[PDB]
Amino acid sequence: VANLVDMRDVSFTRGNRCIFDNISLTVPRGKITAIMGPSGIGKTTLLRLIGGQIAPDHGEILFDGENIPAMSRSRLYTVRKRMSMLFQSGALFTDMNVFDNVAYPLREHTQLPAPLLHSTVMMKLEAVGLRGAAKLMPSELSGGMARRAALARAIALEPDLIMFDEPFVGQDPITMGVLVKLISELNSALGVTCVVVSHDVPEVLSIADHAWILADKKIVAHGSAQALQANPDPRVRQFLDGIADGPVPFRYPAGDYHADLLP
Amino acid sequence: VANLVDMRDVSFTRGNRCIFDNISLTVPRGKITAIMGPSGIGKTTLLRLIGGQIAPDHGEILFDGENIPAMSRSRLYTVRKRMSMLFQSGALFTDMNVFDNVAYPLREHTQLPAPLLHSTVMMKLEAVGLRGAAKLMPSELSGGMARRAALARAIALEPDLIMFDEPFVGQDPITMGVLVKLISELNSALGVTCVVVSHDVPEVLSIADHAWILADKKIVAHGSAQALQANPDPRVRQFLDGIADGPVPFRYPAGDYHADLLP
Amino acid sequence: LNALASLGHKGIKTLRTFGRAGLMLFNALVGKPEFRKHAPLLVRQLYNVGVLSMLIIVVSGVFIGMVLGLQGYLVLTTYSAETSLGMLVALSLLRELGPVVAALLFAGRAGSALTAEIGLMRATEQLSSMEMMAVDPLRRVISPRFWAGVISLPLLTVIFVAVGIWGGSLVGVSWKGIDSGFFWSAMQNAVDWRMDLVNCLIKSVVFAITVTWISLFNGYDAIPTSAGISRATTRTVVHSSLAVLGLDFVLTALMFG
Amino acid sequence: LNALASLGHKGIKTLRTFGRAGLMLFNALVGKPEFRKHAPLLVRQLYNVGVLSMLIIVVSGVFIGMVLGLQGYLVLTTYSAETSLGMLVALSLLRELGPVVAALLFAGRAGSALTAEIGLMRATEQLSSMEMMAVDPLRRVISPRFWAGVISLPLLTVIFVAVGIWGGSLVGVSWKGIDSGFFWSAMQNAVDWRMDLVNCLIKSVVFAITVTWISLFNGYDAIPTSAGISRATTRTVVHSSLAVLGLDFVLTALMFG
Amino acid sequence: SLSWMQTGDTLALSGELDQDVLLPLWEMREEAVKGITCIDLSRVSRVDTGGLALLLHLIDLAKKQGNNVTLQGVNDKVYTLAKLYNLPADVLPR
Amino acid sequence: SLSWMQTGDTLALSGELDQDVLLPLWEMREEAVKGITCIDLSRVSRVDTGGLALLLHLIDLAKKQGNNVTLQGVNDKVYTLAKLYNLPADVLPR
Ligand SMILES: CCCCCCCC/C=C/CCCCCCCC(=O)O[C@H](COC(=O)CCCCCCCCCCCCCCC)COP(=O)(O)OC[C@@H](O)CO
Ligand SMILES: CCCCCCCC/C=C/CCCCCCCC(=O)O[C@H](COC(=O)CCCCCCCCCCCCCCC)COP(=O)(O)OC[C@@H](O)CO
Ligand SMILES: CCCCCCCC/C=C/CCCCCCCC(=O)O[C@H](COC(=O)CCCCCCCCCCCCCCC)COP(=O)(O)OC[C@@H](O)CO
Ligand SMILES: CCCCCCCC/C=C/CCCCCCCC(=O)O[C@H](COC(=O)CCCCCCCCCCCCCCC)COP(=O)(O)OC[C@@H](O)CO
Ligand SMILES: CCCCCCCC/C=C/CCCCCCCC(=O)O[C@H](COC(=O)CCCCCCCCCCCCCCC)COP(=O)(O)OC[C@@H](O)CO
Ligand SMILES: CCCCCCCC/C=C/CCCCCCCC(=O)O[C@H](COC(=O)CCCCCCCCCCCCCCC)COP(=O)(O)OC[C@@H](O)CO
Ligand SMILES: CCCCCCCC/C=C\CCCCCCCC(=O)O[C@H](COC(=O)CCCCCCCCCCCCCCC)COP(=O)(O)OC[C@@H](O)CO
Ligand SMILES: CCCCCCCC/C=C\CCCCCCCC(=O)O[C@H](COC(=O)CCCCCCCCCCCCCCC)COP(=O)(O)OC[C@@H](O)CO
Ligand SMILES: CCCCCCCC/C=C\CCCCCCCC(=O)O[C@H](COC(=O)CCCCCCCCCCCCCCC)COP(=O)(O)OC[C@@H](O)CO
Ligand SMILES: CCCCCCCC/C=C\CCCCCCCC(=O)O[C@H](COC(=O)CCCCCCCCCCCCCCC)COP(=O)(O)OC[C@@H](O)CO
């Protein structure tokens, strides 16, 4: 199959608020796919539909041709060894120093000796540049580097899909430059399909091959990087440029003056 | 005095880690001054030296000609009515809805009736665009808008100096576009001197009149926006562009191979 | 030795933790009365500390008085002295159980909620933004919560003793069939106003100062992270329970020794 | 009426909170034993729950036994029965004070630290990143902490009774001068192995299941914010203390009624 | 430092419209806007948000009991504040 | 699916160097690198990080008891992994 992930027509509701009415998006194999949008639309829920967590209300999510919501529990656990997820916190366990975090999925689904496990984790920690930090605890890790240590844990079982949940958020320009270099290197080597969810437009568009913009609950635009910087939609142009006023209003919906100004 | 704030030769230590060896910077009156640098250098401590909080070890901070560390407690409280500070959280009190947050310094140092206090807070809430959100609690505020409600509280007593502590961090491009419009409007009107501390380079340089780059514990560069995009220093060029490797190394300081690779 | 130098290092930083706690309470309670600004602040804190603690106090007092009435009945019925059950239940609550058990439940419910509240106000920079408006946070935040705890634990103790005596009579008179005229009259000429009622109030005021001072300081001195607040909330329950039970022995040797 | 519909709305969502708690414990304790993977995980949790609770248990047991020895001396010396002080101290600890007070201090110190720990593991997405590695977090995180609490509260109760009996003899024999041969021999033929020692262990196992199940569920079901974790930590201390004291009355009416 | 003097139909203000010195002029309402048709304001030093809200209440009072009220003499920095606070044209003329 | 056959001084591997099928070849060490001077590797399908670490341990063993060891036949995708993992030139030749 040319598409690794294929969401057909997905809907979701959280209590009574509606997120994602009838969205549809494809993730090609071997390419970096971006999903961008505003900062309250709940687009980290999109990675939990793909990951085999909370079920949709109506739709079909296909991981390499197989439907994830209509799937057994034991079938879900052996499919989840093919995909990985890097959380925004860098979700490291708070005991177990950086060596024991990376080696944790390799002590669970493998039969490797105590040598070739020391060599494998040291090679994974070197690909992200934290081989010297192998004995530090995660409380000393200065959380720009906690996302790099949780990226070495994500490539441990050699997955087919890595889902990134806001990699560039609150980060310095040097730290954003390191993470852009690492996602580009792990896609050239290893052939991994990457799905990046973010709202940092100039960093993400420098590496993505196909972007999808989720302005309202629909999927209002998609295309390449050059084909999105020429789109004429007003909702698309406000997000990609940073205009203060547009279809998302600067003023809150208020009443009128002369009733609170002169009550 | 042409300089509102004037740090002469300041030093600070936190236990035994040294921050800011011998820095010196001036803040002109009526201009927006930026202070940029990496994301672990403790540059929010710089706003607490100016604010009349924790004292330096060696130096002289002059607010309009008067030394803040050599100052009485009752003299400090009447000088602190001239400066304000916008914290990164948008430090709103968690009871007391958005009207009562903005009206809190106006019920403390003023004698205004119950009319002209309703009209003053409604004018301040309209300048930031949250007049309709006047009865919401801060737990419902969607924290891009919590920084706008805490900006209406900061302009309540008509200060001379507003210190911004990372206004653009983890924010969407539309939300960053609103805050750039508000700091530019409150400096054109009202003549306020603004001091912005950040590590978001393209947003801050679009409004700043003079930037100061704090790479190591020194004050390694300063100048205008065009005069900083032509500086040839290697430490300056890595921060302003986002290079992964340079004088701040990509690799952690490690040992060698052939001892952990082949132990 | 490298062990004696490390022990004297922890003995120095324990001294200046007691000194930071004495400076926090002195600068909160002293200077410029402000009876009109602080009177609405006292009533809101008297809701969080006092009204929200009434469920754990009323329900626990009925169960403890019912266990006392059942366990004291089986002892006294051997010696045909079961009409003295009301004297036994009332005196064992006015000493040593009314003051102590209501202070251990106050430290777990209201003492934990006070450490967690103040440490959250430093994690979100609310106490630093009050100093920038030239408002002293020690007089505006700390001191209305101190007086709300010193007022409400003596009031919660007298509710604990009242519903505990009622639960003891609910077992003795209603279930076991002791004569209710003998039950109540034996209690009334055994309970003195000075040895029993006043000594119950002295204990619950000493406990209310200690529990509230420990609980307010551990939030003010906490490390303002999400893990450092939870560590300080646990530290309140340990330090309050060791201080309530320790002071309870010293006041028992004084008042009834 | 608009009041009856709101009361039945809270009565429905209370039923499915009890159902979520029954599903959490069933899916944690049942299936595929794994005695070698979980044996290092049990020893680390037996340090956090058991070893770190020994300070509040040993110090509180000495003070409570000393108050019992001082208050029971003044009662018994009226009837010249003060050689029966050791029978009074030991029996009032093996029933109703050893089990109960050690469970209230276990709920405040170890029950609060278990709710705060698990709710922090959901706020930092550690439990969701374990499901992505195809590891069940109910068997790997919840169940080693359950058995560590069921093991360590019966062991902390027997330390509480031992240092409480020693503190009672420290007042009776050493300070007041009761004959130590009369003190210890009156205790030894009053304490039965079935009515007193076994009934102390049944109470502390029922209390250990209840306190640990409440404390693990309130962290697993918490709202994963810094204010929602502190609200769930307070909810553990209230729900554990009302359940310990409520079950203590039902077991007292059964065992000694 | 804020005094007001009336010349039949003008309410010529003088001084500074700061927040602290406006309690006399606030508690002299309905007694200073009796037959006023124009507010001079040419002799004020500077004005802030507290003083601008008092100016909105005098024009509101002198309209409900009379005409439409005109102004003059403003500093053209009272107009930058009305630009920032987004005041409509009917509560502050021209 | 990983078998090895020796021809005097070559250790021609065949199959796949996945992580699961390497426990025979790991627990046949010092018995397969006796007089080996060259490792053929021309008949392997694909290799991952677990298999590449086993290859580093065979070249290390066949150097401490003998010569410098050469290779051939590699897929030129074992070289992209050694580029990514930043392996030095003395632990993997050419
Ligand atoms: C001719 C033939 C002759 C035949 C004659 C044959 C028969 C002759 C005798 C028969 C038996 C007599 C029956 C005795 C029945 C009377 C028993 C009784 O009522 O005891 C009362 C209990 O109160 C008490 O202090 C006990 C009160 C306090 C109890 C201690 C608290 C229990 C828990 C500990 C706290 C733990 C920390 C908190 C836990 C976390 C003492 O009140 P009392 O009157 O003394 O006045 C107060 C003042 O004088 C101090 O004593
Ligand atoms: C650190 C911050 C401080 C905050 C302070 C917070 C508030 C402090 C107290 C509030 C009210 C206390 C209510 C107590 C009511 C009890 C007061 C009371 O009447 O008890 C008297 C003794 O008291 C006593 O031993 C002395 C016991 C009372 C002390 C209990 C509280 C201890 C701490 C108090 C410290 C402040 C005191 C300032 C005083 C200079 C007995 O005599 P009484 O006529 O009955 O018959 C005598 C007969 O036996 C022969 O004449
Ligand atoms: C009007 C009457 C007024 C009377 C006035 C009398 C004055 C009474 C003073 C009370 C001070 C209370 C201050 C609070 C002190 C509480 C004691 C305490 O801090 O607890 C532990 C020490 O316990 C300990 O060694 C044992 C601590 C003792 C507890 C305090 C007892 C109070 C006084 C009772 C003495 C009876 C003597 C009887 C002699 C016969 C600390 O360990 P820990 O690192 O794990 O911390 C946990 C965390 O650090 C985990 O890493
Ligand atoms: C000819 C002339 C004749 C002259 C003759 C004149 C004189 C004649 C009499 C003189 C007086 C007799 C003195 C009596 C001294 C004996 C008093 C005594 O020892 O009492 C023991 C106390 O244990 C007990 O259950 C009391 C034990 C439990 C105490 C209750 C716990 C207190 C706290 C409550 C919990 C609150 C919740 C927890 C707090 C949060 C009962 O043990 P007992 O032997 O019965 O064996 C056990 C089994 O038989 C059950 O009874
Ligand atoms: C929800 C998750 C479940 C996790 C389960 C956790 C672990 C569960 C227990 C562990 C060990 C319990 C230690 C208790 C030791 C006490 C056991 C004991 O010997 O007591 C017997 C009675 O017990 C009794 O009434 C019954 C009382 C014991 C029950 C106490 C725990 C209650 C919950 C237990 C539930 C599991 C039980 C599964 C059983 C099918 C008395 O007879 P005994 O020979 O002395 O002389 C009889 C003579 O009087 C005439 O022959
Ligand atoms: C081998 C022996 C096995 C025996 C097995 C027996 C089975 C025993 C079941 C225990 C269930 C324990 C579950 C925990 C329930 C704890 C009770 C509880 O939840 O507390 C409050 C209700 O209290 C209440 O109405 C009162 C609650 C009752 C407490 C539970 C008692 C346990 C049973 C004792 C009954 C004695 C009857 C004696 C009859 C003579 C809640 O309010 P609240 O919104 O503020 O929440 C705080 C927050 O929401 C603030 O917003
Ligand atoms: C109304 C009248 C009654 C009022 C009653 C007044 C009683 C209440 C007063 C103050 C409590 C307020 C809070 C005071 C501070 C809370 C108690 C305290 O000191 O804290 C820790 C206990 O240290 C500890 O080992 C506990 C250390 C011992 C506690 C002292 C026992 C009580 C005093 C016996 C003297 C012993 C001297 C030697 C005996 C001769 C020390 O933190 P530590 O350094 O670990 O840093 C690491 C990290 O935990 C915090 O920095
Ligand atoms: C043996 C027992 C003896 C009798 C015991 C009788 C029961 C106990 C009596 C009085 C104590 C009640 C204290 C009154 C508390 C009132 C104070 C209050 O309103 O607290 C709010 C709710 O509290 C609450 O948990 C609501 C409290 C509920 C009280 C518990 C009633 C349980 C009854 C059903 C249980 C079935 C068990 C079996 C019974 C047969 C907390 O919200 P908060 O303020 O932050 O904001 C406002 C907004 O959120 C509230 O809508
Ligand atoms: C070894 C053998 C012994 C084992 C002992 C077993 C005992 C332990 C079992 C389970 C405890 C585990 C935790 C269970 C849940 C904890 C108790 C619970 O239900 O929670 C709240 C209490 O509601 C409450 O009003 C308390 C409600 C009443 C509590 C029930 C009393 C006990 C059962 C009496 C029946 C009464 C029926 C009527 C009487 C005829 C309900 O949250 P609520 O909806 O507010 O949502 C808002 C927000 O607070 C959370 O959603
Ligand atoms: C009347 C009393 C009767 C006698 C009572 C005697 C006293 C009580 C006896 C035994 C209980 C001790 C339990 C042993 C606990 C040992 C377990 C332990 O090591 O816990 C660590 C420290 O604990 C600790 O608070 C150190 C515990 C200190 C124990 C308290 C000693 C106080 C002595 C000075 C007080 C002066 C008061 C006046 C005395 C005259 C916590 O770190 P954590 O594991 O997370 O990581 C590791 C790394 O951080 C530790 O370096």
Author numbering:
A (entry chain B), B (entry chain E): 5 to 267
C (entry chain D), D (entry chain A): 3 to 259
E (entry chain F), F (entry chain C): 4 to 97
Please give sentences taken from the publication describing this entry.
The IM MlaFEDB complex functions as an ABC transporter to translocate phospholipids between the IM and periplasm. This complex is composed of four components, namely the NBD protein MlaF, the TMD protein MlaE, the phospholipid-binding protein MlaD, and the auxiliary protein MlaB. MlaFEDB is assembled in a stoichiometry of 2:2:6:2 (MlaF:MlaE:MlaD:MlaB). MlaD forms a hexameric disc-shaped ring on top of MlaE, with a central pore lined by hydrophobic residues and has been shown to contain phospholipids.
